[PDB]
Design a protein around this ligand. Structure first.
Ligand SMILES: CCCCCCCCCCCCCCCC(=O)O
Length: 133
């Protein structure tokens, strides 16, 4: 059941995003702009296919995928990764693999807010999104 994740979401809090992006090898200037950017994430479904848009004044991305089926992805920071998204414990878990590395993007609804936890290396970033009507 992915349905409570669907809709338009706006970033309202961020913790440790610089640590996360730095761990991925993102350069200082991009990290600087990212620290002041508040994306909008739009999650939509059509049958078995989810589409996840991330929009901002800096970078935009869009992916479409079926839960549990690997897909190719080119991330906002230009990594070419092998990805899979599943539901696990009611959380939407996105795993990216490239060059033997991994990162996870885990989304979980808590009190109506969408909490995105990003882990790479030892870095753990928590970002909070609120629903927009
Ligand atoms: C959409 C603006 C992002 C700007 C950051 C660019 C370099 C870091 C990108 C890291 C991977 C994507 C992180 C997504 C974060 C999110 O959806 O809130």
């Amino acid at each position: 059941m992915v349905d409570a994740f669907l809709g338009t979401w706006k970033l309202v809090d961020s913790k440790n995003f610089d640590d996360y992006s730095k761990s991925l090898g993102v350069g200082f200037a991009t990290r600087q702009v990212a620290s002041m950017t508040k994306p909008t994430t739009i999650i939509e479904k059509n049958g078995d296919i989810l589409t996840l848009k991330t929009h901002s004044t800096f970078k935009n991305t869009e992916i479409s995928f079926k839960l549990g089926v690997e897909f190719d992805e080119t991330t906002a920071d230009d990594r070419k990764v092998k990805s899979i998204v599943t539901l696990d414990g009611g959380k939407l878990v996105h795993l990216q693999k490239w060059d033997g590395q991994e990162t996870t993007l885990v989304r979980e609804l808590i009190d109506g807010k969408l909490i995105l936890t990003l882990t790479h290396g030892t870095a753990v970033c928590t970002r909070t999104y609120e629903k927009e009507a």
